[PDB]
Design a protein around this ligand. Structure first.
Ligand SMILES: CCCCCCCC/C=C/CCCCCCCC(=O)OC[C@H](COP(=O)(O)OCCN)OC(=O)CCCCCCC/C=C/CCCCCCCC
Ligand SMILES: CCCCCCCC/C=C/CCCCCCCC(=O)OC[C@H](COP(=O)(O)OCCN)OC(=O)CCCCCCC/C=C/CCCCCCCC
Ligand SMILES: CCCCCCCC/C=C\CCCCCCCC(=O)O[C@H](COC(=O)CCCCCCC/C=C/CCCCCCCC)COP(=O)(O)OCCN
Ligand SMILES: CC(C)CCC[C@@H](C)[C@H]1CC[C@H]2[C@@H]3CC=C4C[C@@H](OC(=O)CCC(=O)O)CC[C@]4(C)[C@H]3CC[C@]12C
Ligand SMILES: C/C(=C\Cc1c(C)c(O)c2ccccc2c1O)CCC[C@H](C)CCC[C@H](C)CCCC(C)C
Ligand SMILES: *[C@@H]1O[C@H](CO)[C@@H](O[C@@H]2O[C@H](CO)[C@@H](O)[C@H](O)[C@H]2NC(C)=O)[C@H](O)[C@H]1NC(C)=O
Ligand SMILES: *[C@@H]1O[C@H](CO)[C@@H](O[C@@H]2O[C@H](CO)[C@@H](O)[C@H](O)[C@H]2NC(C)=O)[C@H](O)[C@H]1NC(C)=O
Ligand SMILES: CC(C)CCC[C@@H](C)[C@H]1CC[C@H]2[C@@H]3CC=C4C[C@@H](O)CC[C@]4(C)[C@H]3CC[C@]12C
Ligand SMILES: *[C@@H]1O[C@H](CO)[C@@H](O)[C@H](O)[C@H]1NC(C)=O
Lengths: 28, 674
């Protein structure tokens, strides 16, 4: 989905994602 | 000679240019250099299919897909897929030739060029160990590392044990010492000396012996942070001197063995483990092969006195007077000095390239600052305005990107904005203006904006040597709040969440609270804010300590009206999740009590299956996991080889019809054996 609606683009209090740890040095 | 065994030379050797050149070209045993070359070549051969991305080349460089890319120079462009495969094949052949010692210099160049091309093609994959691999290959290109244990000597009498100059070891030792010292010189920050960078690392089972006599907080602060800083600052000095070499060797071996299991950093730990014996005597492999039993001393190459070589120089009291240095002896000394100066200067050159300076100095990858700063991202919003009609629209964050590092750097954000502006007319959008709204917290701070959300990035001015004006400064005079924030977070239940926000004066936050987020409130901590209800068109001012309740399924706006930044927090609970969990618990408890005397059922049974699998994995020995790991690695290697063969055949002969290629692709993706 390229586009978003107004309601879904302003959901600040949502689970971000937390893709494991994924620090800049790790490859994973 | 008081100082003639603690340092290896005398003070008179540095009293003139000629004496320095004579000292730096002293002949040396090449055995340790040869062993290091063999090990580095093997490690790079193993690393190419895994981390360099040979196994995902088709996914990354598909023929006709829309991607935004981030090269260091925009003029640099990738090639078609088949030529990319050819480049990777040449790099792999060069690594194999470096490992074997066969056609040493051509192999060195053949590894070195495509590697740096691939590195510079993409800024979003840079890290410190890839940079180190490139630097090491660059150094080894100019070294006589094929003079012992090569294939070149076993075919050309000249490279069988000949001497090498002294600066070959000096450059490598300087490089290893530099990284260690530089790494220990960047760990003098208050965000690290205060235990904030890695607060959850000590919870690993590998730190159990320390917990026998230490508490959790004390083992996180004393061992992980201060111990690591001390090891970094002392490793090079410990390894240089022979009175402490065994102690230093044991410490670095334990450090790198622990790091190999704590993180996932490819082959960096093994390269660091293999680079440590370079500090010992250059003849240690000969002693090691002499200490082994006599039954195995007759198949290895014979141990004999090394033969003279033209690379080094010979100064003897009776063996003539001296040889005037030529164009080869002075070049080595000049290269050593200049390379060491540049390696010392580059990690501290951020005061010149100000256009790459965000909250953190410079681009990530070449400053030896590992695990110092940790980022958390709360929300990203991208909005565009149509240039012909004027409507507002919103994009999914990261649509045509294959990475996520664009949210922290202004150069990458500018590249992304230009890519979006060029690609959006394909979706019935005239020349757009794009705005970004990104919220970041660094090392458990208040979440704040990093970029100005009122600035159009397509027309914004960016220069490599000018400090960017649309970057929001980091609110440094709010860090001491971290202890209170941790207290508040730990003083909550198991179903309550909290978000901490710091907002700048003159700005505002628009928020849509989800329908299922019942029981949501906001509490002011500093400054003053105004909360506006969009549906009711009602304003409300807040003072420090005031708490206000917000409705769900609606819109609200927070305005910062203080002359200084204000801080507040959100407290909310997933009411739908709470109700579902409580009714699931009710149903399961009733069913079990009856026994002893529907999405929820699906979720519970899959969770139970996951727990059963975890318990079975815990109970099973490690040999099954070892076999699975070997199978995964073999699958990766086989798929990479088959893809490379298909691409090479297409390039050399010609692509067949759309059936044979599909059959080959299906065959390549087959697992070897389960
Ligand atoms: C004072 C000169 C530097 C020597 C270090 C003094 C003690 C500090 C300890 C540093 C830890 C590692 C440093 C990097 C190692 C490179 C130097 C090196 O290998 O020296 C030893 C080696 C002798 O080797 P062996 O006899 O096997 O010694 C082993 C038994 N100890 O000696 C030499 O390399 C002679 C070269 C003299 C120095 C010239 C080149 C090194 C230059 C250092 C940094 C360059 C920057 C130049 C500064 C410009 C502005 C002033
Ligand atoms: C050649 C390879 C070297 C890099 C090796 C990697 C490891 C080293 C780590 C350092 C990397 C970070 C610093 C990079 C140096 C400068 C980069 C550079 O010039 O190009 C950047 C920039 C491209 O921007 P992007 O972000 O791709 O575009 C976004 C807009 N859509 O380039 C340009 O804009 C073109 C202009 C290039 C300038 C040439 C620079 C050479 C030196 C110029 C003379 C010296 C200047 C001294 C001060 C000048 C004051 C006026
Ligand atoms: C002067 C120098 C002296 C130095 C002495 C110090 C000792 C050196 C320290 C060790 C160096 C070598 C270690 C390298 C091997 C270990 C690497 C390793 O374990 O890496 C694994 C990776 O695993 C592999 O690399 C598996 C490779 C498969 C085995 C290959 C080796 C066996 C080769 C046999 C000989 C050749 C076979 C030829 C057959 C083909 C013929 C057609 C890490 O796993 P990741 O994938 O990061 O896991 C995290 C999950 N995300
Ligand atoms: C019976 C039919 C199905 C034949 C299928 C056999 C495949 C599973 C074979 C054929 C080619 C083999 C590959 C040929 C070459 C290599 C290079 C080899 O390279 C090395 O890294 C070894 C040397 C080193 O350790 O540096 C690793 C194994 C691998 C990928 C082999 C893995 C197994 C492959 C894919
Ligand atoms: C996360 C840490 C460092 C980041 C890092 C990493 C991962 C490296 O790979 C580096 C390689 C070279 C140079 C710098 C590197 C670097 O900066 C410290 C990790 C904490 C560490 C495991 C604590 C162990 C040290 C104490 C002293 C243990 C005591 C020893 C007992 C035997 C008593
Ligand atoms: C809405 O949520 C708040 C916070 O989670 C609840 O307030 C808690 O109330 C209990 C007693 O019921 C106290 O022990 C806690 O200290 C309170 N927490 C805070 C942060 O003040 C509130 O009860 C919830 N309301 C409803 C109707 O469930
Ligand atoms: C609630 O108060 C805020 C105070 O900031 C009002 O925000 C202003 O609204 C006007 C409306 O045209 C804008 O022009 C201003 O730029 C806004 N900000 C400031 C700092 O003045 C908001 O409009 C008020 N809402 C209601 C319903 O009265
Ligand atoms: C296939 C083609 C494009 C490859 C071209 C490779 C060129 C651009 C590579 C080859 C060796 C590389 C250099 C090797 C070593 C260093 C020292 C380091 O501290 C900064 C980068 C720097 C200066 C590299 C810059 C890029 C470089 C000059
Ligand atoms: C938890 O809340 C998020 C939004 O905050 C919502 O998408 C999700 O559905 C909720 N959980 C459940 C189980 O409904």
């Amino acid at each position: 989905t390229v586009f978003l609606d107004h309601e879904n683009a302003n959901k600040i209090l949502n689970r971000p994602k937390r893709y494991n740890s994924g620090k800049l040095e790790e490859f994973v | 000679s008081r100082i003639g065994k603690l340092l290896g030379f005398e003070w008179t050797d540095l009293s003139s240019w000629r004496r320095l050149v004579t000292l730096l070209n002293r002949p040396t045993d090449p055995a340790s250099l040869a062993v290091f070359r063999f090990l580095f070549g093997f490690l790079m051969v193993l690393d190419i299919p895994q981390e360099r991305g040979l196994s995902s080349l088709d996914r990354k460089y598909l023929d006709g897909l829309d991607v935004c890319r981030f090269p260091l120079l925009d003029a640099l462009r990738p090639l078609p897929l088949d030529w990319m495969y050819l480049v990777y094949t040449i790099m792999f052949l060069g690594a194999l030739g470096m490992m074997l010692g066969l056609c040493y210099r051509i192999s060195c160049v053949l590894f070195l060029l495509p590697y740096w091309y691939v590195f510079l093609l993409d800024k979003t994959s840079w890290n410190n160990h890839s940079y180190l691999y490139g630097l090491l290959a660059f150094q080894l290109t100019f070294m006589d590392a094929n003079h012992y244990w090569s294939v070149d000597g076993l075919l050309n009498a000249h490279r069988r044990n000949a001497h090498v100059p002294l600066w070959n070891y000096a450059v490598l030792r300087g490089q290893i010492f530099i990284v260690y010292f530089i790494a220990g010189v960047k760990k003098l920050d208050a965000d690290w000396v205060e235990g904030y960078s890695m607060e959850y690392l000590s919870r690993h089972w590998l730190f159990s012996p320390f917990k026998l006599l230490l508490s959790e907080e004390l083992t996180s602060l004393l061992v992980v942070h201060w111990g690591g800083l001390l090891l970094d600052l002392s490793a090079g000095f410990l390894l240089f001197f022979d009175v402490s070499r065994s102690i230093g060797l044991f410490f670095v071996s334990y450090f790198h063995c622990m790091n190999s299991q704590l993180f996932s950093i490819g082959m960096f730990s093994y390269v660091m483990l293999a680079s440590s014996p370079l500090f010992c005597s250059p003849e240690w492999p000969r002693k090691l092969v002499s200490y082994c039993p006599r039954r195995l001393q007759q198949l290895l190459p014979l141990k004999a006195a090394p033969q003279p070589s033209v690379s080094c120089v010979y100064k003897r009291s009776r063996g003539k007077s001296g040889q005037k240095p030529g164009l080869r002896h002075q070049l080595g000394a000049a290269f050593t000095l200049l390379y060491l100066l540049e390696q010392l200067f580059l990690p501290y050159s951020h005061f010149l390239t100000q256009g790459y300076n965000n909250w953190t100095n410079g681009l990530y990858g070449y400053s030896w600052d590992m695990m110092v700063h940790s980022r958390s991202h709360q929300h990203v919003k991208i909005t565009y305005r149509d240039g012909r009609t004027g409507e507002l629209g919103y994009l999914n964050p990261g649509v045509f990107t294959q990475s996520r590092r664009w949210k922290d750097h202004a150069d990458m954000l500018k590249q992304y904005a230009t890519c979006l502006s060029r690609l959006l007319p394909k979706y019935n959008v005239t020349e757009p203006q794009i705005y970004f709204d990104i919220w970041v917290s660094i090392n458990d701070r208040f979440q704040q904006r990093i970029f100005d959300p009122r600035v159009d990035i397509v027309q914004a001015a960016w220069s490599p040597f000018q400090r960017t004006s649309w970057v929001q400064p980091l609110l440094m005079d709010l860090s001491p709040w971290r202890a209170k924030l941790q207290e508040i977070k730990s003083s909550l239940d198991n179903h309550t969440e909290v978000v901490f926000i710091a907002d700048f004066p003159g700005l505002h936050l628009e928020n849509f609270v989800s329908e299922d987020l019942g029981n949501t409130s906001i509490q002011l901590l500093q400054g003053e804010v105004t909360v506006e209800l969009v549906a009711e068109q009602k304003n409300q001012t807040l003072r420090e300590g005031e708490k206000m309740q917000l409705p769900a399924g609606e819109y609200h706006k927070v305005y910062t009206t203080s002359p200084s930044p204000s801080c507040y927090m959100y407290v909310y609970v997933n009411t739908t999740e709470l109700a579902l969990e409580q009714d699931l618990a009710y149903l399961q408890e009733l069913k079990e009590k009856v026994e002893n005397g529907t999405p929820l059922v699906q979720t519970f049974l899959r969770r139970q299956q996951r727990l059963q699998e975890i318990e079975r994995r815990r109970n099973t020995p490690f040999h099954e996991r070892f076999f699975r790991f070997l199978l995964r690695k073999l699958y990766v290697f086989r798929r990479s080889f088959l893809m490379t063969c298909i691409s090479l055949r297409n390039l050399i002969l010609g692509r067949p019809s759309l059936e044979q290629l599909a059959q080959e692709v299906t065959y390549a993706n087959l697992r070897p054996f389960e």
